[PDB]
């Protein structure tokens, strides 16, 4: 039972175009279980989740109602922020928040988080001890004085030390048949001629989960971490992920290279090389 | 602090009324509450700057509130009814969740006919010689009777200046005709000084009653003097003996 | 939604414990307290979440399970007499600050009359001729004044008077009529008063 529950909030003002947009998506490691969008036509969570829909209607209505209270809070924040930085009313701005908690196999809380960002730049975050703040610039300092004067940290610490943890090890049990699982990577190595004296050796890893993974090449045992092209881990569109590492090799020594794959869904790190046919 | 006007209002059943609120400068949030006798304040509407975001508490369509530049706010009531009689409170704050600072509120009374409005009669009762003997103290009693609506402020004045030390005024008025629904009100207050102060004939004691009634815009066809906002006082001179 | 006693009594100079129950409280809910002095607007007193929030005049203690709490005034005074309200503004996250004062608790603060001398005097007009008023005063705070049994007789509630510099606080009630089959000896008959109450001749 070693995972983490995290929420990613977004509030983007749309002056001169309409009303603000708000999104709040929930995550349990690399699996999204809930989604709250202010553009939704009927509150149905276009991201629903098995183990979530098994809770009553009280739960779904309760969360839906909290989310809407939060759209007002963030609407007040955008307007205050607009003032702290002396911005006009027309400019579109964004406010994002990231909060959650991590747990050990124990099941207990390992650490809690609560960070905010304005227009893509850090603004204010909650400290390791969950009792103090760290304001980036002098505007966040305004929010700092305000929050401690009202002793806001205590409500954040309480959510993280309680609700966050309590509900996590409830989603873990109600979905132990999906959240504690690991899908191993399918791996093969392709060969793509560049010309007469060169050719690319691409190592693929497909259909795995979680997203975490490490692809490494090697030339006669030497790590080629430097001259290796490596793409960003990408979703396949089915809860699974992909990634590939590539190295350029001279036509002929393409047997000296080996690809190494590390992944939780793997019993032991894998070693592979290109095989003609 | 937060200000509200008018402080008092008397309205005829069916006319429209307008209350105003001036929140602490800079405060973003502004709330309106309605408080009827014996009950606690009731949320009416809320403002985030100039935008009214929660009006879940407005009794009907008759209530309309605004706050154009996100500062001063107006609460207007169309076709006032008896159920509208209450004290309207106003509170502003740094943000929706921070501590709210309230205004003195507007005390509104809705009656069927303005002919129900009567200013108070005032009488001052002098200290008994019995009390003076027995305790070397003297208690003057002021009685304000027959007024409606219940919008009065009573104060004591000694030799020209207003006094607070040694004063005790009833928090609320007694109904003169409890049975009737248009009963007028009676209020009472006391001023207590030592015998040697009230025994100085050159000392002046005045009971002042500030009454809040009809304004110029109000119509009046009755023969008796229009019950307008006026002060009515009674006086008494120290008695040697 | 919370519930608390409709009223509570206390003597000046004493710590006051105002209780409150909030069974369905959330983990993110804050406990706020407001009060309302006579004919005034409501004012903030204190607010807390879990740990005890202390302060000069008032402290707040919250039950471990958080389904009940107490507002603590360390030393009541006459100015502390008013209505106290226990509130949960955030309502588990479904609300944003909007206040839901319930009925609250009316706190009456009785003065410590350390030198009783109950009496009922008759006060004459300074202007009319046959207008009289009865004044029951200087009685201790144990005594309560009840309304007459007659609709022709009016009686005020007892109110505390403070002669500020000599710091002489005293209770007093007033009764009066339009009749005259009305003397002061019978004025407060519907009340339980000190047997030694002085009735002038």
């Amino acid at each position: 039972g070693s995972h983490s529950m995290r929420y990613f909030d977004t509030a983007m003002s749309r002056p001169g175009r309409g009303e603000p947009r708000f999104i709040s998506v929930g995550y349990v490691d690399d699996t999204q279980f809930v989604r709250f969008d202010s553009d939704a036509a009927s509150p149905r969570e276009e991201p629903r989740a098995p183990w979530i829909e098994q809770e009553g209607p009280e739960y779904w209505d309760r969360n839906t109602q909290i989310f809407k209270t939060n759209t007002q809070t963030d609407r007040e924040s955008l307007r205050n922020l607009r003032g702290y930085y002396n911005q006009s009313e027309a400019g579109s701005h964004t406010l994002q928040s990231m909060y959650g908690c991590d747990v050990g196999p124990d099941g207990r809380l390992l650490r809690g988080h609560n960070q905010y960002a304005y227009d893509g730049k850090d603004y204010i975050a909650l400290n390791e001890d969950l009792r103090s703040w760290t304001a980036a610039d002098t505007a966040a300092q305004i929010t700092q004085r305000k929050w401690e004067a009202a002793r806001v940290a205590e409500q954040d610490r309480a959510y993280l030390e309680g609700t966050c943890v309590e509900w996590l090890r409830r989603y873990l049990e109600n979905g132990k048949d999906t959240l504690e699982r690991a899908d191993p990577p399918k791996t093969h190595v392709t060969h793509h001629p560049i010309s007469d004296h060169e050719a690319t050796l691409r190592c693929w890893a497909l259909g795995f989960y979680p997203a975490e993974i490490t692809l490494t090449w090697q030339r006669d045992g030497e790590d080629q971490t430097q001259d290796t092209e490596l793409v960003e881990t990408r979703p396949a569109g089915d809860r699974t992920f992909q990634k590939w590492a590539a190295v350029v090799v001279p036509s002929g020594e393409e047997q000296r290279y080996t690809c190494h794959v590390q992944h939780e869904g793997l019993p032991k790190p894998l070693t592979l090389r290109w095989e003609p046919s | 602090g937060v200000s509200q006007s008018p402080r008092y209002k008397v309205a005829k059943r069916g006319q429209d009324v307008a209350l105003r609120c001036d929140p602490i400068s800079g405060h973003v949030s502004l709330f309106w509450y309605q408080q009827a006798l014996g009950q606690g304040p009731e949320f009416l509407t809320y403002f985030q700057n100039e935008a009214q975001l929660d009006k879940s508490g407005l009794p009907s369509d008759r209530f309309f509130a605004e706050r154009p530049e996100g500062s001063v706010s107006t609460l207007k009531i169309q076709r006032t009814q008896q159920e509208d009689s209450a004290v309207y409170l106003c509170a502003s704050s740094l943000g929706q969740a921070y501590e709210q600072y309230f205004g003195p509120g507007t005390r509104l009374t809705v009656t069927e006919d303005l002919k129900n409005v009567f200013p108070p009669e005032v009488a001052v009762f002098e200290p008994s010689e019995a009390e003076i003997s027995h305790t070397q103290k003297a208690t003057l009693v002021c009685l304000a009777t027959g007024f409606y609506p219940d919008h009065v402020e009573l104060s004591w004045w000694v030799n020209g200046k207003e006094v607070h030390s040694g004063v005790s005024t009833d928090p609320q008025p007694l109904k003169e005709q409890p049975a009737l629904n248009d009963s007028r009100y009676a209020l009472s207050s006391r001023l207590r000084v030592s015998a040697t102060f009230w025994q100085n004939p050159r000392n002046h004691f005045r009971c002042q009653v500030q009454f809040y009634g009809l304004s110029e815009n109000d119509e009046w066809t009755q023969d008796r003097a229009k019950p307008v906002t006026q002060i009515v006082s009674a006086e008494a001179w120290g008695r040697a003996d | 939604k919370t519930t608390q006693p409709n009223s509570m009594e206390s003597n000046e100079e004493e710590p006051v414990h105002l209780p409150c129950n909030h069974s369905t409280i959330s983990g993110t809910d804050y406990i706020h307290w407001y009060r309302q002095l006579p004919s005034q607007g409501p004012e903030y007193v204190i607010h807390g979440l879990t740990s005890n929030v202390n302060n000069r005049m008032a402290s707040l203690a919250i039950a471990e399970d958080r389904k009940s709490s107490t507002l603590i005034l360390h030393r009541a005074t006459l100015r502390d007499a008013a209505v106290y309200y226990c509130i949960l503004p955030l309502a588990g996250g479904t609300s944003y600050g909007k206040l839901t004062f319930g009925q609250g608790t009316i706190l009456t603060v009785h003065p410590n009359i350390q030198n009783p001398d109950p009496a009922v005097y008759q006060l004459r007009d300074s202007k009319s001729s046959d207008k009289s008023v009865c004044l029951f005063t200087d009685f201790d705070s144990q005594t309560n004044v009840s309304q007459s049994k007659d609709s022709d007789v009016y009686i005020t509630d007892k109110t505390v008077l403070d002669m500020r510099s000599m710091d002489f606080k005293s209770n007093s009630a007033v009764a009066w009529s339009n009749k005259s089959d009305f003397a002061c000896a019978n004025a407060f008959n519907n009340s339980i008063i000190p047997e030694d109450t002085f009735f002038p001749s």
Binding site: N70, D74, L81 | - | -
Partner: peptide
Amino acid sequence: FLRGRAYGL
């Protein structure tokens, strides 16, 4: 379970 934030920045 969403956190109910009420205190704006």
